[PDB]
Symmetry: none
């Protein structure tokens, strides 16, 4: 699915299939993703995170 | 060791220990970092990248050619 | 920042700026480094890896899952 | 081809197809290689380096 997120306050979008590492501090879900061959980063409030991304977050937390 | 750069026209400084990824496009060094629970992204010219950051870049590029 | 380890039963110290690659096998942290024109390899338990070296390990593992 | 080399003074061997970065300081040709999914390192005197490895060294020097 598509994730709408901010990086340096700018609105961007990426498919969840590109997402590689996910974590949460307070309301912010931060993640790294494959940005056409190099890493990119994003930030999304937890309330705005799609089901698929929340699933990734909880899996990543289980792996910590 | 601090990396000083411009973030949306504002002067910012980030400790190298906060840097999570670094990449290069020509003379530009792009870095992703932790900032108070968020990820931020900065860019510096290679001349303004501290040696510690350039060493991270060389490791990242070596890891990318391992396969 | 120095990494202190045993190299063929001898006490050795290497500056983190000399480290070229780092990997982990269980609790073992393996690192490849420059030493007077040669590459050497050391191993430390993760408890004896300085935070700077553990940060290099986390970057290497992130670069390995980018693809 | 096979390269016979030393790491921490111990004799090892690896195929040149695994070699990834090559450089030389004095008589020592040092290199990194893919060691079954993680990097390994080696050192070989230039006089003991096979043709294939010397070719890699000169290419790497041209890229510096
Ligand atoms: Cl690094």
């Amino acid at each position: 699915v598509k994730v709408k997120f901010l990086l340096n306050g700018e609105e961007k979008e990426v498919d969840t299939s590109k997402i590689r590492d996910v974590s949460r501090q307070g309301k912010n879900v931060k993640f790294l993703y494959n940005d056409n061959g190099k890493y990119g980063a994003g930030n999304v409030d937890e309330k705005d995170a799609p089901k698929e991304l929340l699933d990734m977050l909880a899996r990543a937390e289980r792996e910590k």
